């Protein structure tokens, strides 16, 4: 029984410019087993219309998925990814750092 | 043409809390997903996920749907069989992963073929590179191995991987020429953030590149710096391109001593980047 | 072109 916690990366598709349309991504990888729950949050609120990629996996058998949603960056709004997996005692939140 | 691959990645999961199982498959040419299948779909069919594959006719979709459903059923069965071999409870959820496919060398001829299985995250059974024999991870997989050795499953796999796999790959490379066959080089930049009083972080960025392979390395006066390099996982942009960065903490005032070296098939010559 | 498993583990 292997169990591997997800690596989580939150970033935009393009360099973020305030007031310009973009995509926010939450990339979860290196995990096992496959059951996982990912929400995108805006100032702490679940965003409804979040699409995701089909489940696949890497050469090392570890799974990965991309979650994403169209958005417009602004100065004020905080974005984040909340992720739950069997390996996690509590859901993990990772804030979007725009320089990153 | 050169490095190319056609791959299928399938995942069978037992769900004793729902009294059933689930099978999912995706197919990739190189870094580009083109089809999917999911047994939890109502009316489950092989489905297109790239524009270029949709100009295949109904018989392609019919045939692929027959064959991936056939495989889903057998993988349903395999999960039950593996429990028996490992003597596992009926209450645990288990995972069976299957990857197969073909790799075309720089000359476009078949270079490698693969067909292998992982159970609960761990290598179980793998077709050898000769494509004539099988490697088994443990006594359980020895049982599958013996069974497949005596049935000569390797021959059927060798025929598929050398024939249909490569031919299909070549039809797909041609159908999807405009996207699959041109490489997009990275757009790069180097950032500098003082990260302590003592040290300065230099970050070399690559954005908007396809395919996903890329080398980012930091150098001072010729010698590579990977010991103290933080390198994130290459990550998808969502539009077919990728992103990566590598960072290095450097003494303040010594920034110009350091260069980031970028190699990628999209580039005419490797880049030597410097903080500006 | 998806291969149909003929064999079961």
Distance, CA of B131 to CA of B110 (rounded, Å) = 12
Distance, CA of B116 to CA of B250 (rounded, Å) = 44
* Cis before A33? omega within 30: yes
Please name the chains neighbouring A, where neighbouring means 3+ C-beta pairs under 8 angstroms.
B
What secondary structure, in 3-state letters, does B28-80 show? EECCEEEEEEECCCCCCCCEECCCHHHHCCHHHHHHHHHHHHHHHHHHHHHHH
Please name the chains neighbouring C, where neighbouring means 3+ C-beta pairs under 8 angstroms.
B
Q: How many CB pairs under 8 A join A and B?
A: 70
Shortest CA gap C6–chain B (Å): 8
Q: Which fold has domain B183-273?
A: Immunoglobulin-like (2.60.40)
Tell me whether residues A2 and B121 touch, CB distance under 8 A.
yes
Distance, CA of B150 to CA of B155 (rounded, Å) = 11
Question: Is residue B109 classed exposed, middle or buried when 0-12, 13-18 and 19+ CB atoms within 10 A define those classes?
Answer: exposed
Residue entry with tokens 């077709």: B127
Distance, CA of A90 to CA of B2 (rounded, Å) = 46
Distance, CA of B116 to CA of B139 (rounded, Å) = 16
- Interchain touch A–B (≥3 Cβ pairs closer than 8 Å): yes
Tell me whether residues B120 and A13 touch, CB distance under 8 A.
no
Beta strands in A32-91 (DSSP E): 37-42, 45-46, 51-52, 56-57, 63-71, 79-84
Tokens of B191: 């950032």
Tell me whether residues A32 and B36 touch, CB distance under 8 A.
no
Distance, CA of B147 to CA of B143 (rounded, Å) = 6
- A33 with A88: CB under 8 angstroms? no
Residues from chain B contacting residue A54 (CB–CB below 8 Å)? 24, 26, 33, 36, 38, 49
The closest alpha carbon to B244, from B210, B200, B275, belongs to B210
The closest alpha carbon to B249, from B225, B232, B270, B273, belongs to B225
Please name the chains neighbouring B, where neighbouring means 3+ C-beta pairs under 8 angstroms.
A, C
Breaks (C-N over 2.5 A) in chain A follow: none
- CATH (domain of A36): 2.60.40.10
Residues from chain C contacting residue B165 (CB–CB below 8 Å)? 1
Using CA coordinates, name the residue in chain A closest to B238. A13
The CATH number of B1-182, from 3.30.500.10, 3.20.20.30, 3.20.20.80, 3.40.605.10, is 3.30.500.10
**C-alpha torsion angle, residues B81, B84, B87, B93 (rounded to 10):** 40
DSSP H stretches of helix in chain A: none
| Nearest CB to C2; choose among B8, B125, B153 | B8
Tell me whether residues A61 and B13 touch, CB distance under 8 A.
no
Q: How was this entry determined?
A: X-ray
B13 vs A: CB within 8 A? yes
Distance, CA of B7 to CA of A92 (rounded, Å) = 32
Q: Let me know how many helices (H) and strands (E) chain C has, helices first.
A: 0, 0
Shortest CA gap A72–chain B (Å): 16
Distance, CA of A7 to CA of A28 (rounded, Å) = 6
Rounded to the nearest angstrom, the gap between the alpha carbon of residue B118 and the centroid of all alpha carbons in its chain is 14
Q: Let me know how many helices (H) and strands (E) chain B has, helices first.
A: 5, 17
The closest alpha carbon to B8, from C8, A54, A92, belongs to A54
Domain count, chain A: 1
The closest alpha carbon to A61, from B161, B109, B137, belongs to B137
Q: B9-41 b/e with 16+ CB inside 10 Å = b?
A: bbbbbbeeeeeebbbbbbbbbbbbbbbbbbbee
Shortest CA gap B74–chain C (Å): 6
Tell me whether residues B120 and A99 touch, CB distance under 8 A.
no
**C-alpha torsion angle, residues B71, B75, B77, B78 (rounded to 10):** 130
Residue entry with tokens 């045939």: B63
A86 vs B: CB within 8 A? no
- A81 with A38: CB under 8 angstroms? yes
Q: Determine the structural domain holding residue A42 and report its residue range.
A: 1-100
Distance, CA of B103 to CA of B80 (rounded, Å) = 32
- Using only C-alpha atoms, chain A has a radius of gyration, in whole angstroms, of 14
Using CA coordinates, name the residue in chain C closest to B167. C1
Residue to substitute from B45, B71, B123, interface C, most C β-carbons within 10 A: B71
Residue entry with tokens 């995250």: B121
Tell me whether residues B26 and A25 touch, CB distance under 8 A.
no
Q: How far apart are the two ends of chain A, measured CA to CA in Å? A: 34
Rounded to the nearest angstrom, the gap between the alpha carbon of residue B268 and the centroid of all alpha carbons in its chain is 26
Domain boundaries of chain B, sorted by first residue: 1-182, 183-273
Residues pairing with B135 in the sheet: B126
């Amino acid at each position: 029984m292997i169990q591997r916690t997800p690596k989580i990366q939150v970033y935009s598709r393009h360099p973020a410019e305030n007031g310009k349309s973009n995509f926010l991504n939450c990339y979860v990888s290196g995990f096992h087993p496959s059951d996982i729950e990912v929400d995108l949050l805006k100032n702490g609120e679940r965003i409804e219309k979040v699409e995701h990629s089909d489940l696949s996996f890497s050469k090392d058998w570890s799974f990965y998925l991309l979650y994403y949603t169209e958005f417009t960056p602004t100065e004020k709004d905080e974005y984040a990814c909340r992720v739950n997996h069997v390996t996690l005692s509590q859901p993990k939140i990772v804030k979007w750092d725009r320089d990153m | 043409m050169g490095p190319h691959s056609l791959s299928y990645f399938s995942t069978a999961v037992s769900r004793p809390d729902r009294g059933d199982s689930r099978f999912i498959a995706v197919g990739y040419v190189d870094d580009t997903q083109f089809v999917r299948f999911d047994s939890d779909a109502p009316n489950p069919r092989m489905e297109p996920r790239a524009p270029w594959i949709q100009q295949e006719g109904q018989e392609y979709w019919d045939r692929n749907t027959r064959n991936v459903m056939g495989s889903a059923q057998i993988n349903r069965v395999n999960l039950k069989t593996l429990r028996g071999y490992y003597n596992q409870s009926e209450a645990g959820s288990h995972t069976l992963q299957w990857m197969y496919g073909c790799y075309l060398g720089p000359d476009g001829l078949l270079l490698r073929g693969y067909d292998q299985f992982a159970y609960d995250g761990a290598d179980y059974l793998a077709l050898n590179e000769d494509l004539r024999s099988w490697t088994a991870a443990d006594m359980a997989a020895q049982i599958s191995k013996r069974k497949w050795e005596a049935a000569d499953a390797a021959e059927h796999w060798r025929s598929y991987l050398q024939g249909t796999c490569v031919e299909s790959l070549r039809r797909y490379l041609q159908m999807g020429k405009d996207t699959l066959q041109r490489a997009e080089p990275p757009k790069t930049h180097v950032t500098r953030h003082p990260s302590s009083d003592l040290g300065v972080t230099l970050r070399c960025w690559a954005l908007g590149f396809h395919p996903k392979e890329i080398s980012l390395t930091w150098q001072r006066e010729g010698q590579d710096q990977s010991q103290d390099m933080e390198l994130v996982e290459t990550r998808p942009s969502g539009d077919g391109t990728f992103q990566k960065w590598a960072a290095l903490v450097v003494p303040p005032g010594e920034e110009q001593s350091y260069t980031c070296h970028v190699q990628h098939e999209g580039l005419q010559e490797p880049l030597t980047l410097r903080w500006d | 072109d998806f291969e149909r498993e003929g064999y079961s583990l």
